[PDB]
Amino acid sequence: ANVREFLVTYINSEEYARTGWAKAQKINVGAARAATIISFPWKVEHTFKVSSIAWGPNRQDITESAPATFILNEDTPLDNSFVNETGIDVNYAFIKGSMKEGEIWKQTFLIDAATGAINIGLLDEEGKAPISFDPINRVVNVDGKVI
Amino acid sequence: SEDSEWVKYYIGALGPTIKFGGVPVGDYKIRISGQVTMPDGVTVDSSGYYEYPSVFTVAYNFVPPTAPTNIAFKAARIADGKERYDARIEWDWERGAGANVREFLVTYINSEEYARTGWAKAQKINVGAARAATIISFPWKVEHTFKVSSIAWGPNRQDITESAPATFILNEDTPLDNSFVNETGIDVNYAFIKGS
Amino acid sequence: SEDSEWVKYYIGALGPTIKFGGVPVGDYKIRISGQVTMPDGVTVDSSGY
């Protein structure tokens, strides 16, 4: 018969194994067939189940479907659609700041997350900042004066 | 309208119990007329016209339902690199003498903003038949006013049955189920910046 | 369908205003037939279809 809406319930896969759908999160969309989750956990699998409920004879009728699980990792293809060119980047890689002159971004500082190397100032022709920090070698090399 | 005519609605045998439909919703008068035919089949006797002195109104047997109750809250924390919290608000409703509730609409706004200007710029979230409302990235240590209204398709176009507003704040005192666990590279929290 | 039959939908007294339901949605033809009984109760006159 007619399906007036689809109800989707999701919960962590490990939590689903531990206690089922006790504290599961429910999201309904109605007549749409696309459910979107904002800021889904990374590299974490969750259990999702979909149930179709329509107004039955007395007050309601329920027709459920099989649960499913899915995880989001780098292997999962991404459409992005957000593109780029946003000032100040906060990622796993580094902390790089640039000022856009003309039509090109020139990095002003770079705080490496993996090694802690820090460059300060506009990079010269040789790719070395006027103030450079190399904690791997622990070298204070600055093209200037120290006070 | 006084110009309304005595529109035919049922013609047939006379009986103490008379049931018929097709009458539009409104206010109408009702009158009856009898008819008897003498065995010749050409001579017919009538009892005249009898009209009820009380005006009846066609309506719908539909009463607005009851109001939602049993306000409940749930909270969880996710720290996928960055600290964040997700809050779930739940409620329960009972059939009672009320009618069907097709959906529940929840409207929320900042508690201070609610005091300042009411629900002027309040944010509305609807779930339908579900009894659990989840907010992603709810503000920390900030109380907001939440109100729930039950709206069903009424007689003309809609029917509204609202419930009392409520407020809630999310702080460290609020228990957290988390469910996100841990072991995520690069931590961005109030504490420090540790890389391993 | 040309094989459709003249399904009964209302039998009763003749009147200028006739209202009845239960007809499924679709395309149908409509025909009427009259009936008059002579006072003997055994002789009945029809107006055809």
Side-chain angles (χ1 to χ4, degrees), chain A residues 4-5 7 10 12 14-15 18 22-26 28 38-42 44 46 55 58-59 92 113, chain B residues 74-76 78 80 84 88 93 95-96 98-103 127 129-130 132 134 136 177 179-181 186:
Chain A
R4 62 181 284 268
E5 59 88 22
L7 164 66
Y10 67 97
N12 183 286
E14 273 183 0
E15 296 291 338
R18 283 192 262 189
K23 279 206 182 177
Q25 307 272 357
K26 315 176 179 182
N28 200 312
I38 309 302
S39 296
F40 189 78
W42 181 257
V44 180
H46 275 230
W55 296 132
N58 48 6
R59 277 225 173 185
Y92 171 62
Chain B
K74 285 187 174 182
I78 302 174
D80 219 344
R84 94 193 176 203
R88 192 200 307 171
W93 182 83
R95 175 155 185 177
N100 275 311
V101 170
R102 62 181 284 268
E103 59 88 22
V127 303
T134 303
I136 309 302
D177 198 25
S179 168
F180 170 72
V181 193
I186 299 299

Side-chain angles (χ1 to χ4, degrees), chain A residues 5-55:
Chain A
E5 59 88 22
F6 291 112
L7 164 66
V8 181
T9 312
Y10 67 97
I11 197 182
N12 183 286
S13 284
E14 273 183 0
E15 296 291 338
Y16 162 68
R18 283 192 262 189
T19 51
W21 308 89
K23 279 206 182 177
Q25 307 272 357
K26 315 176 179 182
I27 287 298
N28 200 312
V29 303
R33 284 190 190 174
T36 303
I37 288 300
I38 309 302
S39 296
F40 189 78
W42 181 257
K43 280 200 166 184
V44 180
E45 186 174 64
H46 275 230
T47 317
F48 321 90
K49 70 173 172 189
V50 180
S51 302
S52 55
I53 295 96
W55 296 132

Side-chain angles (χ1 to χ4, degrees), chain B residues 6-35:
Chain B
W6 286 101
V7 180
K8 303 180 185 179
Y9 276 103
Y10 161 67
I11 305 169
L14 160 72
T17 302
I18 299 163
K19 298 185 179 185
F20 68 101
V23 188
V25 174
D27 299 333
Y28 319 88
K29 276 171 181 179
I30 175 167
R31 75 183 186 178
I32 195 180
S33 176
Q35 209 59 255

